[PDB]
Amino acid sequence: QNYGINLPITGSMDTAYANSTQEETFLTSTLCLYYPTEAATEINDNSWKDTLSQLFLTKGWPTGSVYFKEYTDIASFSVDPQLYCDYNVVLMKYDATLQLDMSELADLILNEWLCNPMDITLYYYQQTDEANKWISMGSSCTIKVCPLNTQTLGIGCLTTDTATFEEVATAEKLVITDVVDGVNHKLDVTTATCTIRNCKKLGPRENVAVIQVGGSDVLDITADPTTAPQTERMMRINWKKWWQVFYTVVDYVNQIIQAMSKRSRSLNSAAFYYRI
Amino acid sequence: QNYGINLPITGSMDTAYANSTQEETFLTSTLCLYYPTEAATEINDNSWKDTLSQLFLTKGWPTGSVYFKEYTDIASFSVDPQLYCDYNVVLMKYDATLQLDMSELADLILNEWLCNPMDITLYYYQQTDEANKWISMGSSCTIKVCPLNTQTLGIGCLTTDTATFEEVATAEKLVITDVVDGVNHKLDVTTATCTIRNCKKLGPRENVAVIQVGGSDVLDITADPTTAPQTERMMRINWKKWWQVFYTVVDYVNQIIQAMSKRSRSLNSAAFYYRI
């Protein structure tokens, strides 16, 4: 492939459409459903997974192709999210208080990132361009920032004294820091319970879809204030019972998968590509 | 200009892109940031304005062009808001209970208005066209309206007994009243505490952009029920901390102002033009 990646692909505008590959896609694919604990608690059934697998079979998926992963809550799920199957549908409960955390999780899992380590104790770090962010994940990520100037002296802060730093994150499981580009910063992060990485957003991750259960369109997967794009993979539904939610997911799995593109599944299950 | 306002301007669809060689009244433009008091409180620093100025300088703004106007809250800021700089960016904190007040403020400052005094004690007033409204603001504005008929007799109210009038606003720092057009209304207002004007919406402002911090898309800058336009000048972001909000504003100031246009700043700082 790589020797033909930078080569043109020519096609005529009269080639006959091929038959529907939805059946073949379902047969040779795997589906991962991510739901919160409250869903399982409300269902209160020990065979609901088997029921959903049988219903998906009625919808064409082979038996052992649909998998279900449970997370305690949005904040818990945001610590090193792992996307396993070819298609990853995430049922995210809506809370008016966790809006930024919902947006950060969606941004992390609905996009492909290229991350590198940051040794905050040794080097001063800056963000090169609008695609560059600092993604911090851990049990408790408290990030404080001290911008510098051309002479390396801090502005509004003292490098020696951390108490003067401009705190930007406190007690966070996942945070995406966006500082002014081209400015060197000195960072204080709770490295004991936090890991911060310099990440670049390569583009969309088309095999991950997020269904927001309840609320309104609040997700903002773009740091740019001027744009809040709602993509095809950002679904939203209204709910009263989790069983109805799962039935809607099963029945319209055709539409959900049709909004997602395969071949975006990395060899690893991580939410980012780690490079040294 | 005035003698050449109504003259055609002809341009070719192949003219090479260039840049103006015309003098401006001021050498450079000025940027005003309007933020709530709680933003400064949470930031908890005395030199934060200086640091933001230095970061804006990093973003190409000469030292002396960025100004920061603090306002207590949305309601207080809604009393005769003043727009000083060439570019005005208003950081409105979202509160779920003040949706109408946020909409009223956005409508006032995102649109040009042409207003006249209203001696409600001497004359009845109509609203001629859908662009006509009654904008009242002050320390506390309560508006009571009695629609009259062709015979100048109140409908569902007694023109002499104010107790029968209809309540359209109670203790409002700012309120835009829209009544049925072509109907004479007898008005009684808390004139001691607020002033009411008959205003006409001329069009968009193009130099005032409102960034809504938190919430969902709730602004309605048009009184027409069947329209909720989301212009490029009304942005929305999610937040947990104010330093991150200000860093986002600084880092994407080029995008923020690309959505705005100069040439719209009035000579006066007021949010409306006034005729007596």
Partner: protein
């Protein structure tokens, strides 16, 4: 100690690249060539700054 991995001149040089690319379009052509024949030496190049 702590070393600044990426130098402080990156942002200033980026802005100056922007300015230079904006200024390119306002160059006269006859006079540019007239300048091109001047043997621009150390003194001539660094005196008019």
């Amino acid at each position: 100690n702590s070393v600044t991995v990426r130098q402080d001149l990156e942002r200033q040089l980026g802005e100056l690249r922007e300015e230079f690319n904006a200024l390119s379009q306002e160059i006269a052509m006859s006079q540019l060539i007239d300048l091109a024949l001047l043997p621009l030496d150390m003194f001539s190049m660094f005196s008019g700054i």
